[PDB]
Amino acid sequence: GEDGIFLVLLGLLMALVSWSMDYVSAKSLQAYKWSYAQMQPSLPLQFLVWVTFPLVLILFSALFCHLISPQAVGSGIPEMKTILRGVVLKEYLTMKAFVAKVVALTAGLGSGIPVGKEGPFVHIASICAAVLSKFMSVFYYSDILTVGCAVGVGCCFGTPLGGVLFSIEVTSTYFAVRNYWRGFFAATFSAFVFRVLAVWNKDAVTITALFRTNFRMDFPFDLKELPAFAAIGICCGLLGAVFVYLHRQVMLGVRKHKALSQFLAKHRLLYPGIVTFVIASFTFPPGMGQFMAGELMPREAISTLFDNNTWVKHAGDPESLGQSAVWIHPRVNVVIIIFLFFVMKFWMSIVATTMPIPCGGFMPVFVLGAAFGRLVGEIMAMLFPDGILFDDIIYKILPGGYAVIGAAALTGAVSHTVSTAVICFELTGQIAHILPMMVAVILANMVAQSLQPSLYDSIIQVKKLPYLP
Amino acid sequence: GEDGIFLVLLGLLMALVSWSMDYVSAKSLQAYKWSYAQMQPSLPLQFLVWVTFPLVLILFSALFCHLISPQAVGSGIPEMKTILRGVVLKEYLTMKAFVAKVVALTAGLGSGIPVGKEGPFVHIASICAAVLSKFMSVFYYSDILTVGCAVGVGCCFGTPLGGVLFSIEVTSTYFAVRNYWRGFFAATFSAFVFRVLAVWNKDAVTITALFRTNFRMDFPFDLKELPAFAAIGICCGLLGAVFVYLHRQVMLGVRKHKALSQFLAKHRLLYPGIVTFVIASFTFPPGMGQFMAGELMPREAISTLFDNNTWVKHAGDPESLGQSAVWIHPRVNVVIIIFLFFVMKFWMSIVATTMPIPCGGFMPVFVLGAAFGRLVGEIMAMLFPDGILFDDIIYKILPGGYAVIGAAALTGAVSHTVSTAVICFELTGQIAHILPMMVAVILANMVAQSLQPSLYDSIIQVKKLPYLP
């Protein structure tokens, strides 16, 4: 009927918005790197620019989520999964919030602070679905929200079927397969237009997925290492649980005492600002980024962590690798700097997503999972030096695969879902490690579902929304 | 709770059954090839053995679906998708049919006649689910059938998430996500045990998917060829529709007249037997297999059609390729033999799946799709000789990708579903062509949903089961 025209118009209007915002964010971020390099090597000057650019940009984003729309702070998927369980929120789906959010999500992304991308984008995709429906036939409600969620995540990442699985498996109890067909149609069209546009205007020469990895697909892994994958199941789930626990121990920590509540009511934007300050103090590269690999914005950080070469063995030479040359210090072994990167981005991510900013809880958790995966992969490669044999040719293990297993498993354990593995392999561009990441996702899910509740369940519990089951 | 023990026991019991039956079928089929080669080149003797082995084995399978269980003929998914819409069939889920079906599906598969594998396997997986539940807690119903369907197709092909999508998207109207989690768990465990067992006992050296393809993943296809994919959408959908139409024009063709009904009631097993005969008459390789590539059992036939080299250009030399050397005739161009293979397996497949045998409608449709795909790929490679340029290196197109697009799209158009692309790329082992196969699956679905009904809908219409919507 007249469903196809509405769905194709939603897809073509969502791809341009996603492409525009990350185009602008990428140009702002490379201008940041450019100016920071190109002034001079002056260590106080480097500190002051490396601090004053993210404070300006994050306080700008907090200003445009405070001023225009007072209801879009703390946004993302948990209040809309509260909405589709029956509760209506009338003023919350206003078009005026839309322009109030997108520009904030630009200025949440153009800095190197770990935030999400998915959550506010799911919200604005639902906004565009509702507005385009209300404009339609003036010249069904949970259907509109489910199609909005599918188009939102499948237009974030160019991952259609991971989009429709992410819409069904957490934001529902029953599900009409009419929405399955509609969400699959609109999500694959949005992911189609978003990827071909980066060949038209910019240069990404073909319809490569987003983050390709050149693994070898000829004996990737034997079953002599397979219980190691069991470890990267279980520990990730355990680590995922601790994340959720500590998240609540900051949320209530904002609201536990009258003193800091009076301090925040004295001036609202002071809480993001200074804490932006302190994580800039641990990201300055000659300050502590030597011990940290601090000079990595997160997109190229996880393009780096999915590399196809062993970092312990290429440390005997000063050979120029890609960006991964920042992962070599002349005094410290690389296992220690992966360890410190993991622990400091781990406590940095919770306090980064705590602040009153449009936040998603997917991307920094994905980065933490990749870091833990490559940690256990590098100690596997250090433990078994020779590799094993094949027809007069030697195959040695490679730790990019461990990184992609961990970057599926830990965010699957945090967000209490099994469909994270789908967008994981659909971002990485290869499915060589597919059933080990499914087994690891399921082990991490059963451990992190035994111990603690989900992330979004804790958010709706602390924010105290009407949530009946 | 006590769900995990039941699901892991179902998975480990289903993997052994699938592995055992295709182990036995593969050994029988290679013994067929072995004896046929190893007697002598005597052209009447070759004819008589090439005919008398499939007649014996197919009449044996028809005997063991006629004798023990009189209710398991015409089995597969459409009567069970009738069952889960409300209608009960009491005597149909008896354990006695289980042993009556599995051995038949061995002797439906050990011959080279095109049959399915999925349908009767979904049925026996539901049988094992129900029996293991009734044995459980003596020392929920649609849940048991949906878990049975997911384990069935994900244990056929080692494809978990394509399994759970194949269970939701056609055999439901609503869907409880409890069954999503259970089906995902049990399907990935079944696909895990099935693939690692082929390294323990037999040799498939690692957890390679099933049918790997070595494409190049470095500029697979430009967007200068992309409307060709539009053609392999639309035509496949049109061709898929014709398949369904002709299928009904044989089913009613059995039941249109009293004469052939009296002829069949005279002797029931005569109808499969002789028609097995006639397709053997068009598969004898010096008879007509020169013009046909007849000496290809279907599994190695579609391992051949997914090859990474151009068949027009490697015809100037008598170089030994793999099995694909059967695709070269010294007098006939290869486009004509792909064309004749397609048209003769097209009319052969409907009459092959017509006969009273446990049949699935997935595998021969998959083969027909691969043949049409490589047809349009070879004429694309014949049309554009030079390829195009890159950094002083030339990239020419390769027609394996067209074959895998067509083998997704035409069976997606026949079975009226979008989740065929998932098991397509999960069998082929690479996701380089993923969003073109999604776009082609959706174009073929909208054309073949405009023209004719589904395959299984026509089956339940002609068999006249109680089907309310």
Residue numbers in the entry:
A (entry chain A), B (entry chain B): 115 to 253, 262 to 591
Paper text:
Despite distinct roles as passively conducting Cl− channels and stoichiometrically coupled secondary active Cl−/H+ antiporters, members of the CLC family share a common homodimeric core architecture, with each subunit harboring an independent ion translocation pathway. Here, we have determined structures of full-length human ClC-1 using single-particle cryo-electron microscopy (cryo-EM), exploiting a purified protein sample that displays Cl−-dependent single-channel–derived ion conductance.
Three-dimensional (3D) classification of particles resulted in several different groups, of which one yielded a 3.6 Å overall resolution density map for the transmembrane domain, allowing confident model building. The final model represents the membrane-spanning portion (note that the N terminus and intracellular αA helix are lacking) as well as parts of two C terminal’s so-called cystathionine-β-synthase (CBS) domains present per monomer (for which some cryo-EM density is left unmodeled) and includes several features that were not observed in the ClC-K structure. Unfortunately, the GluGATE side chain is not visible in our cryo-EM density maps, but carboxylate groups of interacting acidic residues are known to be frequently undetectable using cryo-EM due to radiation damage. The pore aperture of the extracellular vestibule is constricted by a hydrophobic barrier with Met485 (Met427 in ClC-K), but in contrast to ClC-K, the gate opening is also controlled by Lys231 (of αE–F) and Arg421 (of αL) that may orchestrate Cl− permeation to or from the extracellular environment. This difference can be attributed to αE–F, with its GluGATE and Lys231 adopting a more CLC-transporter–like configuration because this loop is considerably shorter than in ClC-K, alongside a side-chain reorientation of Arg421.
